[PDB]
Amino acid sequence: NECVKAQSKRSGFCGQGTHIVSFVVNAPNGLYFMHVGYYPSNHIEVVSAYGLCDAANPTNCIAPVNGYFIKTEWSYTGSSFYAPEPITSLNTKYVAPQVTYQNISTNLPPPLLG
Amino acid sequence: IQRLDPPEQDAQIDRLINGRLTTLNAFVAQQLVRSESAALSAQLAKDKVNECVKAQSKRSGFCGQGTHIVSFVVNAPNGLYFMHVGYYPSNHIEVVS
Amino acid sequence: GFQKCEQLLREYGQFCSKINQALHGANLRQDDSVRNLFASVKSSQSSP
Amino acid sequence: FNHPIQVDQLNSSYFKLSIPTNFSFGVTQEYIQTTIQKVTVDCKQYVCN
Amino acid sequence: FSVDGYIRRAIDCGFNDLSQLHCSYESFDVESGVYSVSSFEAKPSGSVV
Amino acid sequence: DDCMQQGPASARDLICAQYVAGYKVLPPLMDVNMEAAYTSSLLGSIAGVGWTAGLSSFAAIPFAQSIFYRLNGVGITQQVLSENQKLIANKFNQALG
Amino acid sequence: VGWTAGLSSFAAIPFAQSIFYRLNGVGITQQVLSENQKLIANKFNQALG
Ligand SMILES: *[C@@H]1O[C@H](CO)[C@@H](O[C@@H]2O[C@H](CO)[C@@H](O[C@@H]3O[C@H](CO)[C@@H](O)[C@H](O[C@H]4O[C@H](CO)[C@@H](O)[C@H](O)[C@@H]4O)[C@@H]3O)[C@H](O)[C@H]2NC(C)=O)[C@H](O)[C@H]1NC(C)=O
Ligand SMILES: *[C@@H]1O[C@H](CO)[C@@H](O)[C@H](O)[C@H]1NC(C)=O
Ligand SMILES: *[C@@H]1O[C@H](CO)[C@@H](O)[C@H](O)[C@H]1NC(C)=O
After folding, report:
1. Are F41 and C43 spatial neighbours (Cβ–Cβ below 8 Å)?
2. DSSP F79
3. What residues form DSSP beta bridges with A24?
4. How many whole angstroms separate alpha carbon A59 and alpha carbon A97?
5. A5-9: long-range contacts at Cβ-Cβ below 8 A with a sequence spacing of 24 or more?
């Protein structure tokens, strides 16, 4: 029910790595599970923000959704695979301002260009 | 052996054998019960590390009591010792919602 | 170590082989349990 | 002991992200026993033949 | 055995397999199911010496 | 050798009984320093593992920052957490101390 | 089955389409999955092969 009929979000319940899909066949005294997971490699280190705020409009802040804001100025990458793309309203959420958010004053992404 | 001849000596040794064979069978049966139990328990420990320690849990009562925030693990003599830090509310008031 | 006893013990079949094999399996079970448990506690990435 | 990738914390408002640049799929195989062989014994015959 | 001690009903436990079942549970009423009972023995048809 | 040069520690010493009774206690699969290494590396992974989607990336963020995200995630607002960061750290410290 | 809310409806969609939703759901963006659909299928196939 957790593995095969659903994608699991429980680390280590199904297989190792991030669970994607599982299959089941019969075995001599039971079931044989075939768990296909996602295994990352070649990790790199990048610098990330906790969130970004409009420096001129400090109460207007965003945080990434299922990914990170990375320096490259700021761009978005999904959490499982480094692949920078523009910060847009489809990969951000508006949040309350925090002391750890960056104050950006130049190349403001579209969710902050208000 | 020192006191008895074979026809009686045999019977006496045999009593000791039966008692010792019985003891060893009981011992083994328990090591199998205890090792089966420990193995199940080990899988519980596995789940707690993944659910509790490597993640914040949203499952009431799985980790500790109250709302789970963070857990830590240290080793213990025959296993793991979980240290579950939860959020415990107090001084509740009633408001209209 | 008494030979008379060992001679009588043999009439109970391979009793000791069963004791040893049962415990050997039971002991392997913990090494496998431990190996699996730690493989899962193990982090991929961690801060110092 | 196989050490994990060490990722340093920063003295700043930023943080280090250790993020994959590559990936693979793999299969964790698992066997779960659901049954045992079912056996009955003709105890009277077994014991007394 | 009735309250007054007389035997009014009985099972011959070696008559058939159904009878063996009733005897093994020491009851005239057993639950529905599939049960193993004593095997049907092969018997000697002669001897060799 | 300890059981010969010193002898049993007390009555019913089950460790020295091994060489007498015919049984042996076997060592565990991992030594202490290896088990410590596993839980130590686990400790250092907590803040950066239970942070976002996927199990593939690691956010090397402060423990404290992790706690505040964990508290926010259970219903405590950011205005509250911001006003009370020292109060929260003190309560946490009392719980563990 | 592992597609949306509830256990009551069935989306008869391609396996491949399911995989891409599963990958998107763990943090791989759609731009990446779109550029790499053949690469992803090949890696998956290697894992099972
Ligand atoms: C991006 O811009 C934001 C917004 O300006 C900036 O975060 C702000 O930083 C200031 C300090 O530089 C915080 O102001 C104070 O900081 C001190 C530090 O000790 C606190 O003690 C103060 O708290 C007291 O006063 C508050 C006033 O209301 C009380 O509510 C509180 O209970 C205490 O009495 C106070 O926090 C300011 O709060 C933050 N802003 C936010 C939203 O947290 C941010 O740092 C800039 N980005 C970067 C990377 O620099
Ligand atoms: C750097 O770390 C020290 C450790 O005590 C801390 O006091 C100092 O404020 C930190 N500096 C920054 C920029 O965070
Ligand atoms: C990912 O790893 C495989 C392993 O052989 C390699 O062939 C491939 O080129 C790698 N891709 C990147 C982007 O490094």
Report:
1. yes
2. H
3. A33
4. 6
5. A5/G1, A5/G2, A6/G1, A6/G2, A7/G2, A7/G22, A7/G25
Residues of chain A with Cβ-Cβ distance to G32 below 8 Å are 78, 81, 83
Query: E1, exposed or middle or buried, with CB in 10 Å at 0-12, 13-18, 19+?
Result: exposed
Give the tokens for residue B13.
């040794």
Rounded Cα distance between F27 and A52, Å, is 54
- CA quadruple C3, C8, C9, C13: dihedral, nearest 10: 130
* Residue B30: half-sphere exposure toward Cβ, Cα within 13 Å: 5
Strand-pair category, A102-104 with A52-54: parallel
Q: F94: burial class by Cβ within 10 Å (0-12, 13-18, 19+)?
A: exposed
Return the half-sphere exposure (C-beta side, CA atoms, 13 A cut-off) of residue E41: 11
Experimental method for this entry?
cryo-EM
Residue A81, CA atoms < 13 Å, CB-side half-sphere: 21
Helix (H, G, I), strand (E, B) or coil at E39: coil
Give me Rg for the CA atoms of chain E. Answer: 16
Count of pairs with CB atoms under 8 A, one residue in A, one in B:
12
Q: How far is the CA of A99 from the centre of ligand 1 (A)?
A: 6
Q: Which residues of B5-21 are buried (b: 16+ CB within 10 A; e: fewer)?
A: eeeeeeeebeeebeeee
Q: How far is G48 from G42, CA to CA, in rounded Å?
A: 10
Is D9 in Cβ contact with F62 (below 8 Å)? yes
Q: Is B47 exposed, middle or buried (0-12, 13-18, 19+ CB in 10 A)?
A: middle
Task: Name the residue type at position E22.
Answer: H
Q: What does this entry list as its resolution, in Å?
A: 2.8
